[PDB]
Coordinates of C-alpha atoms (C1' of nucleotides) in Angstrom, one line a residue:
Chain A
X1 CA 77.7 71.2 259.7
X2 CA 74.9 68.9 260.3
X3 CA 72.5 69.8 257.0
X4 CA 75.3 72.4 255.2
X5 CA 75.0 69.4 252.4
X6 CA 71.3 69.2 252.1
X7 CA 71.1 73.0 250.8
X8 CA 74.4 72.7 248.9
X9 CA 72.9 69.8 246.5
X10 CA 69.2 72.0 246.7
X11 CA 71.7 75.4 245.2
X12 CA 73.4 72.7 242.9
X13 CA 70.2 71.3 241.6
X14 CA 69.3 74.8 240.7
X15 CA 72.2 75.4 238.9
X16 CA 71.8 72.4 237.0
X17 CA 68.4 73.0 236.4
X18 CA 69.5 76.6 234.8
X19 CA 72.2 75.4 232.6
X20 CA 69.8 72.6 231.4
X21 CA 67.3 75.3 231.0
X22 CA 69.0 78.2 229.3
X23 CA 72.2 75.7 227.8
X24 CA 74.0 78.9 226.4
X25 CA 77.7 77.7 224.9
X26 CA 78.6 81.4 224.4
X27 CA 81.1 83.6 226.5
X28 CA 81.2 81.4 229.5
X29 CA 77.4 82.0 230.1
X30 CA 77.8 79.0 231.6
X31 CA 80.7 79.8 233.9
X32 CA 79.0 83.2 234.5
X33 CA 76.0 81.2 236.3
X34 CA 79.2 78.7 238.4
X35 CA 80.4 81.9 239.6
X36 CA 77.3 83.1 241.2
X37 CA 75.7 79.5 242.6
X38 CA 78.8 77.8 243.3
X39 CA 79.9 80.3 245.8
X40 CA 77.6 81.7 248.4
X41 CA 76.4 84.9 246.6
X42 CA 73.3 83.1 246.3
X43 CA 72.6 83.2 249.6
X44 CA 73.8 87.2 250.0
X45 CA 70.8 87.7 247.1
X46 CA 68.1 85.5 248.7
X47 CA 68.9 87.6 251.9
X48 CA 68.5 90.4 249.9
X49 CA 64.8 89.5 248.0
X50 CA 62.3 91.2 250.3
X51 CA 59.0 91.4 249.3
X52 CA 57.4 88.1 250.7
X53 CA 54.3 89.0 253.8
X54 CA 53.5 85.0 254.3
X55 CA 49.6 86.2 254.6
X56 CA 46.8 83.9 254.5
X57 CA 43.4 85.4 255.6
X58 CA 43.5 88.5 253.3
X59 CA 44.9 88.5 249.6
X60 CA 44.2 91.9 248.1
X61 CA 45.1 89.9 244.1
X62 CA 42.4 88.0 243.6
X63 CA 40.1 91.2 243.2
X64 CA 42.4 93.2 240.7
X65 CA 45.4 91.4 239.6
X66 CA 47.4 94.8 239.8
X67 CA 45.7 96.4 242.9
X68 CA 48.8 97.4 245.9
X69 CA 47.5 97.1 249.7
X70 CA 47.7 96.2 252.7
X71 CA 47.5 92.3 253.5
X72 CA 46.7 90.4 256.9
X73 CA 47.9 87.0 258.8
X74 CA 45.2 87.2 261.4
X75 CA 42.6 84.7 261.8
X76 CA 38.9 86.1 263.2
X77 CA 37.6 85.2 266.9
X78 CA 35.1 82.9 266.5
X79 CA 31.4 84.1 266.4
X80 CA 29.2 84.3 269.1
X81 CA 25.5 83.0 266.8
X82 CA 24.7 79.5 266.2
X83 CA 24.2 78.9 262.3
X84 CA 26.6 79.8 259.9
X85 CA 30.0 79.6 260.3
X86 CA 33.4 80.5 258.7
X87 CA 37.4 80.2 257.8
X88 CA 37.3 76.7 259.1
X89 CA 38.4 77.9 262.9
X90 CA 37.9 74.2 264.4
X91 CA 39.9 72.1 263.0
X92 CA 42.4 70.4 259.8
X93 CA 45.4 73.0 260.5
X94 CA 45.7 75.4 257.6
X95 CA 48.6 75.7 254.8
X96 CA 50.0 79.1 254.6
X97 CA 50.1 81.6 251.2
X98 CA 53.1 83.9 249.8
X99 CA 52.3 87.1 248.9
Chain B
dC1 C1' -52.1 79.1 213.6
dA2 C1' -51.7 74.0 216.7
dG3 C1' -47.2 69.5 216.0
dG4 C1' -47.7 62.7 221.3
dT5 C1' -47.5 60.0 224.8
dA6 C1' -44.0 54.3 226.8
dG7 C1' -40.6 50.5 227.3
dA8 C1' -36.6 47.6 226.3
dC9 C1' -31.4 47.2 223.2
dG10 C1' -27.4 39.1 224.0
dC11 C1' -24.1 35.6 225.1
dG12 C1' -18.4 32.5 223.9
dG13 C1' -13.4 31.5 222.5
dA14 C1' -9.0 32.0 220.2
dC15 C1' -4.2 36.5 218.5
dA16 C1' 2.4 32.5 214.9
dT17 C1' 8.0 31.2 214.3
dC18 C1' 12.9 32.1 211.6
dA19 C1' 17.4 34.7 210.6
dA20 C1' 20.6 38.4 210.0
dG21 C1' 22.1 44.7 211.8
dC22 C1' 28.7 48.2 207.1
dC23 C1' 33.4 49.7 206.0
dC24 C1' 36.8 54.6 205.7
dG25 C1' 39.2 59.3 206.8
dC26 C1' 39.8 63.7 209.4
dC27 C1' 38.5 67.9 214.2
dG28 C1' 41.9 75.7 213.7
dT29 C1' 45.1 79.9 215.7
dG30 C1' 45.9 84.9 217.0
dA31 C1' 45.2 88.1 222.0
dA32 C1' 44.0 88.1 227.1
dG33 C1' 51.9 88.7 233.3
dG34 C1' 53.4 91.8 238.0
dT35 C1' 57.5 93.7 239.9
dG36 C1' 61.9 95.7 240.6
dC37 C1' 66.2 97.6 238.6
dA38 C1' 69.4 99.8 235.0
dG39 C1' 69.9 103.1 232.0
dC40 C1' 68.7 107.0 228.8
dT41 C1' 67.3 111.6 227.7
dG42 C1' 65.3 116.2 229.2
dC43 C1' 65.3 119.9 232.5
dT44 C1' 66.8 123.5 236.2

DNA sequence: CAGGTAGACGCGGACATCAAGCCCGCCGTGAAGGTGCAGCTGCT
């Protein structure tokens, strides 16, 4: 209704984008990627792709690149000690990660 | 078996200008990606 076009040109600019990028000319590859964008089975699949955790204190990956556990969104209290200090807890509102 | 005592060692003034400082061509490639799904053989 009100932004309906907004996501229609972003799943069009990805189709472009893919037929630009792969440019097959054989057996309707092309019209093979128009029947899945142009319709709304892209939207049925992006429902469908679980996997994301949207996790920003704890990233098990940077220790072993192929290492499965369990990661956190939880930011610490802050400490009791005067000194040292960590994760930034005052201030400059953080960016989230994708996991 | 032996072999010396003593006291002092100078001043002055000056130390140069000129002009320039190269061109050319080129700098290696190879290996260092997870994850999820479909489908194929082998087995009970």
């Amino acid at each position: 209704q009100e932004l309906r076009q907004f996501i229609e040109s972003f799943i069009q600019e990805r189709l472009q984008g893919k037929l630009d990028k792969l440019h097959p000319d054989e057996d309707d590859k092309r019209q093979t990627l128009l029947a899945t964008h142009r319709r709304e089975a892209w939207l049925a699949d992006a429902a469908r792709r679980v996997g994301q955790l949207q996790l920003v204190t704890h990233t098990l990956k940077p220790i072993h690149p192929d290492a499965r556990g369990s990661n956190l969104h939880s930011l610490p209290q802050a400490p009791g000690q005067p000194g040292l200090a960590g994760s930034h807890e005052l201030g400059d509102r953080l960016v989230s990660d994708v996991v």
